[PDB]
């Protein structure tokens, strides 16, 4: 080439001129080569997976108990692939449309 | 039937202009100038799309027709140089 160098622009100013080598406190390549991480992860998942634990007014009504004992019917934590309604867009559309 | 027939007559009258083929191959080099304008239109058509097959084939037919050997071998050599795969086109140039 030996050409096409004329004028500069922004965002091209000198930046991050000094890189950062891996410190011995974060990640050491030799310590990773000698690492026990197989058994360390087996023991970590072994502990985490090891412990997980945690009256005339009423008679005058023409109706009776209707909705009772129904709670878990709506899953508290559920990840649905369908983005149309699921849990999220059900309350999202319920709050944004009324 | 009057709607479809009316669309047939209006569609038949919807053609835009007839050809004006006058002064065909006259005034000596003027025909070569017309061939330069036609080759320029083919160069612009092949210039619009670098992946164009059709336009290259028409440039090859009109080339081999009016360009004799040299410029025709330049059309087949340029299109062949711009085509690696799709060897069927290389069989057309062959």
């Amino acid at each position: 080439l030996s050409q096409l160098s004329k004028q500069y622009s922004s965002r091209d100013l000198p930046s991050h001129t000094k890189i950062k080598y891996r410190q011995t406190t974060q990640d050491a390549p030799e310590e990773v080569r000698n690492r026990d991480f197989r058994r360390e992860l087996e023991e970590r998942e072994r502990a985490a997976a090891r412990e997980k634990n945690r009256r005339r007014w009423d008679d005058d009504v023409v109706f009776k108990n209707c909705a009772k004992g129904v709670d878990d019917q709506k899953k508290d934590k559920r990840f649905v692939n369908d983005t149309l309604r699921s849990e999220f867009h059900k309350k999202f559309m319920e709050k944004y449309i009324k | 039937t009057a709607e479809q027939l009316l669309r047939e007559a209006k569609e038949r009258e919807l053609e835009l202009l007839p050809p004006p083929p006058q002064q065909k191959i006259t005034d000596e080099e003027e025909l070569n100038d017309y061939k330069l304008r036609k080759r320029k239109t083919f160069e612009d058509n092949i210039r619009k799309n670098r992946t164009v097959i059709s336009n290259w084939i028409k440039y090859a037919q009109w080339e081999e027709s009016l360009k004799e050997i040299q410029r025709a071998r330049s059309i087949y050599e340029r299109a062949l140089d711009v085509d690696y795969r799709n060897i069927t086109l290389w069989l057309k140039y062959a």
């Binding site: - | 479809q4 027939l5 669309r7 047939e8 569609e11 069927t88």
Partner: protein
């Protein structure tokens, strides 16, 4: 399927394989369309370099303008055979259309309607 044999007769073909099939049937129809030749006299032109596939000289003198015209005849024959695709097969019926694209959309629409 069938590998090879010695015979000439009618067949069907004209199927989806297209390129490979039309080239195989075109080369078979071209080879069967052109019988043998004077190569016995070229059998006098034969000498010692014939066999030994890998070639020492692949060019030599070719033949002459004779083989040039005889080479140009099957080119015009393949041009006339390539000029045969379909016929006009037109008429005045049903509704109108616009140029080619509406006729192609009518053929594809007829292909989609019948299933």
């Amino acid at each position: 399927a069938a590998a090879q044999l010695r015979q000439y007769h009618r067949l069907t073909k004209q199927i989806k394989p297209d390129m490979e099939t039309y080239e195989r049937l075109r080369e078979k129809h071209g080879e069967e369309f052109f019988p043998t030749s004077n190569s016995l006299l070229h059998g006098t032109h034969v000498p010692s370099t014939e066999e030994i596939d890998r070639m020492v000289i692949d060019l030599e003198k070719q033949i002459e303008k004779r083989d040039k015209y005889s080479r140009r005849r099957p080119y015009n024959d393949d041009a006339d055979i390539d000029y045969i695709n379909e016929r006009n097969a037109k008429f005045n019926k049903k509704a109108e259309r616009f140029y080619g694209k509406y006729t192609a959309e009518i053929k594809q629409n007829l292909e989609r309607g019948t299933a």
